[PDB]
Design a protein around this ligand. Sequence first.
Ligand SMILES: C=CS(=O)(=O)N1CCN(Cc2ccc(OC(F)(F)F)cc2)CC1
Ligand SMILES: C=CS(=O)(=O)N1CCN(Cc2ccc(OC(F)(F)F)cc2)CC1
Ligand SMILES: [Cl-]
Ligand SMILES: [Cl-]
Ligand SMILES: [Cl-]
Ligand code: NA
Ligand code: NA
Lengths: 311, 320
Amino acid sequence: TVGAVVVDHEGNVAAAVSSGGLALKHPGRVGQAALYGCGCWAENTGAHNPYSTAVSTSGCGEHLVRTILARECSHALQAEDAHQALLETMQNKFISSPFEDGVLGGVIVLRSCRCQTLLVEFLWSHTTESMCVGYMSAQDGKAKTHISRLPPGAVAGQSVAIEGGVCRLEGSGSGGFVLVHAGAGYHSESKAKEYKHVCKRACQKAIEKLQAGALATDAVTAALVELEDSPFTNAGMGSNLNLLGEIECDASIMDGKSLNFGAVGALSGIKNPVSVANRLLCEGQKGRIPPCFLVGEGAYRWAVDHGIPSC
Amino acid sequence: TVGAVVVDHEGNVAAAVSSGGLALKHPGRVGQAALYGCGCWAENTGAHNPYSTAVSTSGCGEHLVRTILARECSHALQAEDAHQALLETMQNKFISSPFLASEDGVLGGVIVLRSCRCQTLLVEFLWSHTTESMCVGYMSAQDGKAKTHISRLPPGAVAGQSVAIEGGVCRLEGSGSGGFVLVHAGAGYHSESKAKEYKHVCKRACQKAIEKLQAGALATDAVTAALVELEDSPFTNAGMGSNLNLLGEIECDASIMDGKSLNFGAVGALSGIKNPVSVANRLLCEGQKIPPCFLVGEGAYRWAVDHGIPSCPLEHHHHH
Ligand SMILES: C=CS(=O)(=O)N1CCN(Cc2ccc(OC(F)(F)F)cc2)CC1
Ligand SMILES: C=CS(=O)(=O)N1CCN(Cc2ccc(OC(F)(F)F)cc2)CC1
Ligand SMILES: [Cl-]
Ligand SMILES: [Cl-]
Ligand SMILES: [Cl-]
Ligand code: NA
Ligand code: NA
């Protein structure tokens, strides 16, 4: 699973997620990365929502589904202390949730507010051994990547790691901020450099999109395309094969300003599943309500009919 | 769309929902009846949950997804006043949701029950809808006569902008094999024509659920038996008689949740299976015995056949 969250120079947020799902899964099994509220969430500041918030989740277990995790995190991040809010959520759902010996997953989040300046707080958290993240603001111009690990002595699925930072943006240009992740799971010293490199490239693509004036959803899509294309990520190319040796992808994207959503489940034969999810969202804005969630052969046919490259 | 909610004599709740989805929909479009939190919800009483609650939805698919309505209703029903909680949710979280602010009119409905022990069980059941009408049926094991009712928006209300809400309370003896069921056969335009037919399938659906309960079956097996009967009606947009998609083909969504285990099963874009809810229930059942909870399309069909759920291969499509 890979994901990204974006805030543009106006404080509009977006989030996306993409996955190959469980290795050897039964054909047609659709997981959290396709499910509204579970895989990602993005919601601009509103009446009962003082922060514009964007969340993308990772893991395996179904625990991301069972708790409607991304939306849960977004709602918890309305509390004053974001670090404490995220930690409490991870602790209650990935250890003590009523909804198993150990719960494995991860999340990236950001929340912004107007101070014209934008205060962006961004965090990542995981109960897996490790998680690779990258982040970048349009004004720093150098993507930062980092491999987050559980401390020495910790036990995956029984402890929570959480880190983050703060970024202050000028709301006057074509800038913004992006945070990505290339997966949460077992630590691998050997491919650490490759994970960091793809997170670096994914951030640079998202920032370049913002700097050309693109929507937050197009910027978060450009990040996920880069993350998908890495043979090392369980999304797009290199997705885990299912029980029959075939690739079936889940992906979704949400726009914080319009609250619109796009998703695909059990999608085969398309190089970049997030591109189809984004196109479903984009066609939803143009619009009977157009579909937001397509699966299987119907999703493939719709992607091809809309000119999304196949593999 | 059809749905049912059940509570057994112990306060164990279950909920299920089944739909054919939107007429002429693009192949592979999956709606609220397959989606966790959206189509149905069931949650027994627990630490931060004084009531066992069960919810099933109806109506336009995309409005129910964007608002995650079934789960929202279940959480609102933890408040003291269930009638007030449901009405506020329908008004504030559904009609006036910012998630549907672009839409002219918000169309949908819910059935709910919640129970608590006062050994006797107090069951409160309600239905609410923003559509012109909604057909419900309900029954307790001790009354032994199913009641059916077509709920309508009052004169002066505007469909998609007004809320209708009714319900009642039922006290069960928690010493037998009893319980209570509430079903619905659809929410949408009033049709005097098939009004009697919808009422009749709701009555039979309640009777099947109660008979299951009286035979000692789990709440999930009783709610599934209600939905099987509701699906089988040629007049409901679920199972047999489901709306045809853009290619003239059948693609069904269905899901079920168990309040005791909090486990969930669901199918989307399923073709060639007579009773989609049976596959959702079997997924939930095999999950109790990481097992899948949500299968779609070709894989969902193959899984159903491999588990002995009655199929019609002539209704199944698999394009390449
Ligand atoms: C069940 C989950 S999964 O099957 O979606 N998946 C399998 C593939 N994994 C790759 C991966 C990526 C980053 C990472 O972090 C590190 F780079 F080491 F810092 C570790 C592993 C992620 C989890
Ligand atoms: C559910 C969403 S649907 O779009 O799948 N659907 C299409 C099928 N309809 C049948 C139906 C059932 C009951 C009813 O109520 C009345 F009996 F009139 F009281 C009216 C129509 C419901 C709307
Ligand atoms: Cl599986
Ligand atoms: Cl459609
Ligand atoms: Cl009546
Ligand atoms: Na990949
Ligand atoms: Na039917």
